[PDB]
């Protein structure tokens, strides 16, 4: 068939008609972005020649191709650790959430770490790590940051934003009650606080349910 681009929608436009929202959803969506790939290394001599001295006596007339090839792969491997540092090591001081998690009805249990410890990871991070799955001179170099360190960086970014809003990004982490942080964020989108405070339980039930649908979507869809 000829594909459909969508459903035609003639907007009810007039020179004196407006549509105003009387409600809201509070939506949580996920974005997945690769940050690094495997740090691989090749011994060009052992790949091309292996253990043969005869081939090793040759391949010297070919020049510095081997020194040029493993220099490029080394630059790639060094860049992968630089990629992870730029993404995750964006935080000074490893922030921790308080033992009393009173965030105005908002429930971050599935994104905060659990001490049951499939590493110091969250419930969502445990779902993520299960969902996605040396010879001839080929070696794989471990990343400088372990998965436990990245999850520690991630939990510090998460603890800072829950407790201190955007202040920790600029300077020192300044504590602010949650749902007072959320009232600031409604002001950023043109909603006049107030709508948050008068709908604080609805805005929370909508947030917690939307977070719950992520763990279902991650567990269900391959």
């Amino acid at each position: 068939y000829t594909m459909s681009l969508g459903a035609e929608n003639s907007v009810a436009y007039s020179n004196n008609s407006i549509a105003i929202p009387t409600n809201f959803t509070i939506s949580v969506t996920t974005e997945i972005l690769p940050v690094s790939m495997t740090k691989t290394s090749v011994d060009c001599t052992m790949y091309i020649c292996g253990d043969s001295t005869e081939c090793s006596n040759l391949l010297l007339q070919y020049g510095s191709f081997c020194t040029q090839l493993n220099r490029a792969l080394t630059g790639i491997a060094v860049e992968q650790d630089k990629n992870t540092q730029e993404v995750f090591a964006q935080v000074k001081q490893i922030y921790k959430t308080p033992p009393i998690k009173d965030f105005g009805g908002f429930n971050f249990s599935q994104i905060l770490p659990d001490p049951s410890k499939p590493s110091k990871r969250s419930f969502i991070e445990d779902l993520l790590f299960n969902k996605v799955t040396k010879f001839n001179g080929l070696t794989v170099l471990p990343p400088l940051l372990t998965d436990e360190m990245i999850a520690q960086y991630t939990s510090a970014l998460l603890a800072g934003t829950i407790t201190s809003g955007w202040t920790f990004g600029a300077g020192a982490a300044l504590q602010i009650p949650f749902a007072m942080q959320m009232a600031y964020r409604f002001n950023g989108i043109g909603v006049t606080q107030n709508v948050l405070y008068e709908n604080q339980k609805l805005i929370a039930n909508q947030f917690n349910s939307a977070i719950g649908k992520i763990q279902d979507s991650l567990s269900s869809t391959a």
Binding site: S41, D43, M46, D51, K134, F135, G137, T139
Partner: protein, 50 residues
């Protein structure tokens, strides 16, 4: 079958007609010795960068 490596005693269960076992990407990673029929596991000799 000529090669280099370390020959551990293996628990691979070869069929009687077979004489050695290959892996993915076709690398000989097991073999049964002609005398005293028994499967051996080949692992590459230790190597790396320094």
């Amino acid at each position: 079958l000529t090669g280099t490596g370390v020959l551990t005693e293996s628990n691979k269960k070869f069929l009687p007609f077979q004489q050695f076992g290959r892996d993915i990407a076709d690398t000989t990673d097991a073999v049964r010795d002609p005398q005293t029929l028994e499967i051996l596991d080949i692992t590459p000799c230790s190597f790396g960068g320094v």
